[PDB]
Amino acid sequence: ISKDFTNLLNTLIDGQIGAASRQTEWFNMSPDERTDYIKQVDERLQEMQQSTLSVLAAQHFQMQDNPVSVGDQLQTLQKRRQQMTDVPGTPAINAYKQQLDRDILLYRRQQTAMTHFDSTWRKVLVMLGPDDSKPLNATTLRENAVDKQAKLDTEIKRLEQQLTIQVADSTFSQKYVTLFSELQAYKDVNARYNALLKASATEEAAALGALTKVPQASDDLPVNISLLMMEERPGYIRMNVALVNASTDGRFKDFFLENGRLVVLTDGVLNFSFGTAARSLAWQQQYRLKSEPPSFRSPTYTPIRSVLVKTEFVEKYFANYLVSESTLRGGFKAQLLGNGRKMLLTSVDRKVPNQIGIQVSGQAPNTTITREVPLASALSDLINQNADIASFRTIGLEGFRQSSYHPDRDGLFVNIHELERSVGFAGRQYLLEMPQDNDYLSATPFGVMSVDGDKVSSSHLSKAQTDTLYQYNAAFFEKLEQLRSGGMKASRLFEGSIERTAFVQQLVRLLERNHITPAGVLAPEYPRDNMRDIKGNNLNKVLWEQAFAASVWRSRDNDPLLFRLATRLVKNPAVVKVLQNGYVQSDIAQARELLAPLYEQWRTRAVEAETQRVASANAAQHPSNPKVHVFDQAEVERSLDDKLLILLLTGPQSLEGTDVQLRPMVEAALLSNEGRSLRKQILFHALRPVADSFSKAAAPVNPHAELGVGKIMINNRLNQPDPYLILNTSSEEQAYRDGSYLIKDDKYRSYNQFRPDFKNDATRYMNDLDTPFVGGISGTTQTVSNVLTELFGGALSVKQYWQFQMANAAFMIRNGYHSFFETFYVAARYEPEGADSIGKEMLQMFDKYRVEGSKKALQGKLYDGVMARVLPIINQGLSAADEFHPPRFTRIGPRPALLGQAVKDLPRQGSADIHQFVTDPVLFAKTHTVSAEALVRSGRLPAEGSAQLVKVGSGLYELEYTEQSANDISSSSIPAYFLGYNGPNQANAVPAYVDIPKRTIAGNFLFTGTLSGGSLVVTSLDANTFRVYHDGRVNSSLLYDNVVMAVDYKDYQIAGTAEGLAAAYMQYVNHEWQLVLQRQEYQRDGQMLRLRLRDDEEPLSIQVADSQVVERNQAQFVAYREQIHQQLKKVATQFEVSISGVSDGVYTEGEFSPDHPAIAAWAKLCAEVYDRINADTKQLVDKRNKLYENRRNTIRRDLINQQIKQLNITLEYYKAQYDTVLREAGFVEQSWLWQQIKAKNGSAAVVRIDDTAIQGGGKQRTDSVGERYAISEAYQRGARGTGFSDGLRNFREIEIPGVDDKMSALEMKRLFLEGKLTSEQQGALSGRITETSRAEYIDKVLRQTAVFSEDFHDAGSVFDRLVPQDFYLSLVGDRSGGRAYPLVRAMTVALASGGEAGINSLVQKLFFASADPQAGSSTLLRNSLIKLHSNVEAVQASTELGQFGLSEVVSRLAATTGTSMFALNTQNHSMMVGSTVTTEGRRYYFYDPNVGIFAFDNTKSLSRAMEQHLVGRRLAVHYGSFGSKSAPAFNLIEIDTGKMAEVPVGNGLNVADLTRFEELSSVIGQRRQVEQVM
């Protein structure tokens, strides 16, 4: 809370960053992350105070010998409290008191219950016994039976009744405990009495014993009283059941709420448990009680499902099980449920009482044979009867979803959240400081951490050490507690104080000692390449290396080599040495589980050997010793593990004898994924001792000059074991005993023993490359790779070598033994000499990148540099469908691959609410937002198809077109008629239309793409059919004739704005079509966007067919045009522009045009009044750029950042106030022009039936075939009768004249744009085009994105950003080639207006929009790059210069002055090229949308790069450039960034607006927040 504490944290943060070397756990944060970090700092400091210093207080106190006794627990605790009621208040003290108090309450309750139980037992024995005239004996008890059994029953009934009434009591109470104890005593004594009556003469004495044996020793409780102590509220126990994982897909056992009922996901679960631990293991050891065995806590670690359940149910079946005392139980008990079902109870733990394996089973419902089967539904219903429906909960569920989100990764931890989720967790143990040694050291409350190069240990604290540690740490924490509240005034840590500096010097080492550092706790969603992991390695490189290791590990590709290796290797005697390794014994333990039936059969053999041991010991002559007359556990266990090892190395073919009968089972096991992974993870461990056993000397075959010739500088480690990462992984509780201990060697210890030696040259080299570091250059990999020719017994092919060597590198990364680099370096040093060897290059490439990394962030360039050289050697034999490809490195975290195995088989499902929508479409449309986006990003929708909804959010559904039949109603789909989307260009003469029956039978709905600046017009074509037109012009309803229904822009326009958005569709209802309009908007909702129904007006409105609609609109349009001319006259007067002579020129002649003389006065007036504000705002635009240039380059972001916000607010006022006016003036002018053209020349001049009568704004515009095709496949103009869909569905059977499979994609695109073929032929040719196109894009570009990065690098580039291969503007058609033409037009605005920061922001936007393809922003972006394919405003921003050879283009750039940009718009594709010259010299840029954007300092370098790229690798021929193969010719188009920036892309966004440093939800927020608010 205190500002002073916040300033202190900011001070040490900034200072600790400034002190950083490379490789540090601090890094610079976002100014939002800053706050999340500080929040977690404060929270975890409070956790320390309550949960470790408090327990230390409980040992500085209690040092004096109070009365202590294991029996007088209550009294011991009571006096420990009265010892300390005098102690001053302090959070560690308060937490200690409160813990001791709650334990006092529990022990008091238990002691009360046990007392009243015993008194009741004695009372009932007196009641059942004879009068004092006789001794208590079985005879008199038998004589009493007929009366006093009924008396016992009567009392039991009375007690049960009274207790059931008392269960209405709101909390545990003396009466409740009393009655419960009485009931248990009566029940148990009744049972024992009846057993005595049933006891035989031989049992009678034992049953009388069991009656006289009162549990008065109190050595264990009555079971039901233990359950009483487990009750969470009187009459209820908390049940829980623990998941393997949250089972969203059914892979795991689960128990979850579904429709208010609780539901077990599977028919029985081994993982139930009851109750909850009374205290943490820390307190458990502080009381020095027995801790609960770890087999309760070990088996799972993910969120847990729990509810309160009625104690009677628990005590009926499960008290038979739940006793902690060793009552005889087998593996199982089967319990008859009253419905005739079984419940099976399973001894899933042989020691712990309160965790249970449970199964319900019974006669299979509705079956021909009475087989009993398990029944999850029966268990669910029985629980729902016995459960409370209230206070079901899942423990930690939000914590999981806010830190892991899902089962995150197949590799080691990266931050403490992933550590704490991992299987190694048990409980968060903070360490604290023991500073009274000469230098500071780390201690637990129980012990100080002894550390050694080999070993880490604790010596338990003697009293003087506890007094030191407590008094010091408490003195520090008291200061911290003061600073949060009394501030600097209280704490006296004034800015000049030496005490302040000492204090900070202590806090910083506290925050390092515990990994509360930023790299420890932030765990972001998408990792900026700045961020660093818990060891200070670069975060993104670690994530990528983990995803690489996983992908290599999962492929089935290398297995024929590795298992050949294993089959040979197993014959060496040294392999036995592998088994006594400590780490191998982690995982062969899992093999004992996987092969359990065989392993059991083996052990049943092995236990025979004991009999031969004892026999041999007796056969020895006159044995003076039981020489081996013993069961040697270690002998059998060794022999068994050795057998399991051999059966894992050599295949199941090794099975022999009777076990061949089980061999089909073993074969089925070992080929599982879990089988293969274990079967090789034991192999690589087995490899090391064998390699060592040859002792062949080191002899690398490739020399390297930079790092010492002839040797390697292996290992390169400093041993500096981290104590926190050790103790926060499960050591044995022997550490917790308050006794000195040596900690286990878990596998992670290999991850935690080592730290880089900054003095060594190899470290200096690696720190120049800035690889991750883990344990240095792998001398192990040297020792292995030196002898491969002897392990395999012959030379490897470079293919076989690189296969083995990549699998080994994956094994090393997977187990956390080394980095990628730490292995591949020695591989490249050891790669065999040979015609295809590649290590020489790889070394030179490392050196080349070293001399860079000392200066620049390599951002993964190294990994691509390696994979470019390895992959074509690995994949050398394979088909393109079967090649291996690793995940691809990116600025965002590593994304999945796009080729080969990773895709092979590795649509949205839709929701049945479609039937509700069908049932009441009006109510549905009133209550849910129906969006249409997928009806925009599909072109060429059929005339007839299946329509379905998909749910996306709360009341939010999307339509999709689909091919699935409605006769699978599970498709959630119905017959409907679609209408294609028409384009946004106001020059369009050819609207989209389709014809549908009056009195339809075939289908009852019609859908269209989202309306944004267009009209839906319904007209009556004849007696029986409507023609429905989607026209892309505003106000189009005025232009057609015989209009019977229409929705124009004005009907859904937000008044006083350019903004509008609406879904429109048609429905056949009450025997007539109804035009249904659902007005929408985009709205901001917590740094995201969503659609919603518009709430400021009726979201739905409806027209039946009408006649007067034309007149009704026309009057409105005339008035509105007059009114907007008033608006513009006003504003122009406000800026002093002369309106004289501005009026409509009488339309005399000619086609539609912008800047036609008739409107020229209005257009000029707009253009000028716009200039009067555009020049004005530019003065702030420059200032804003100056600001962003200082924001990127300074520490104190939040100082100046708000100024950005205020300048934005200022500008957006001007936009909101005047852009709307100018836009509306343009629209009303284009509309009046088109109306004049109709009025003079008739509708046939203003609507055309098809586009084949080629004409436009000029007689030809020489648009590339690529562009004119993409336009022809992202808008519908003309109808699409079924023939086109039939051709598309049959396109592999159909044949087309003058086409063959070896035509280029270009020559097909051309012939398709000839339009001469039938619709069935055009459908087939379209399909053939898309198939050929993506086959070529795969073969030419995705498979070679690696080498281009390196060509641009060593041609000399000075900045680069790869762009996502994956971002597509349409899921259908040619995905590859359609995005190029809009993207270059956006990018050139970005670059001209914001330089390298613009390019960064835009590529970030593309990345997010490809990672989350269905988030609101990624939809809006896709819907806003479309509408740049043919927007005539973009043609206003163009000038098609001639063809040029590349050299001339370069010379032209050299000739340019000031910023200038050019597209190349090659015949089938569009690179971009251009220059900026403002400062930092002249930088020349090049951009290929299939690869990335690159920059250069000099035109010589630029041409040297661009030639290599376009001709050196022949891509100019794949892009179909003009003229000769050598010296290709390109068009070029001198884009005017002054005008291109301002083209409308719908929803009121200028392209600049999508092209900006903020997120779209920011800009839209600012608009709503300054327009509608204020």
Author numbering: 4 to 909, 924 to 1591
Please give me the paper's original passages concerning this structure.
To test the role of the C-terminal region of Mcf1 in the autoprocessing reaction, we purified a Mcf1 mutant devoid of 15 C-terminal amino acids (Δ15C) and incubated it with Arf3 in vitro. Strikingly, the autocleavage reaction proceeded several times faster than with the wild-type toxin and yielded the same fragments. This result demonstrates that the C-terminus of Mcf1 is a potential regulatory element that prevents autoprocessing of Mcf1 prior to its translocation into the target cell. To decipher the molecular mechanism of the activation process, we analyzed the Mcf1-Arf3 interaction by cryo-EM and single particle analysis. To obtain a stable complex, we used the C1397A Δ15C variant of Mcf1 to make sure that the protease is inactive and the C-terminus does not interfere with the interaction (see above) and determined structures of the Mcf1 variant in the absence and presence of Arf3. During particle selection and 2D classification, we noticed in both datasets that the Mcf1 head domain was clearly visible, while the tail domain was absent in most 2D classes or blurry in others. This is in contrast to the single particle analysis of the wild type and suggests, that the removal of the last 15 amino acids destabilizes the neck regions leading to a high flexibility between the head and tail. Therefore, we only concentrated on the heads for the following analysis. During 3D refinement and classification, we noticed that the heads were also very heterogenous and the ABD was missing in most classes of Mcf1C1397A Δ15C. Nevertheless, we managed to determine a cryo-EM structure of the complete head of Mcf1C1397A Δ15C in absence of Arf3 at 3.5 Å resolution. The comparison of the Mcf1C1397A Δ15C-Arf3 structure with Mcf1C1397A Δ15C, however, showed that the position of the protease domain is not altered and the cleavable linker is more or less in the same position, indicating that Arf3 binding does not induce direct conformational changes.
The bacterial Makes caterpillars floppy 1 (Mcf1) toxin promotes apoptosis in insects, leading to loss of body turgor and death. The structure reveals that Mcf1 is divided into an N-terminal head region and a C-terminal tail region. The head contains an N-terminal effector domain (NED), an activator-binding domain (ABD), and a protease effector domain (PED). The tail consists of two putative translocation and three putative receptor-binding domains.
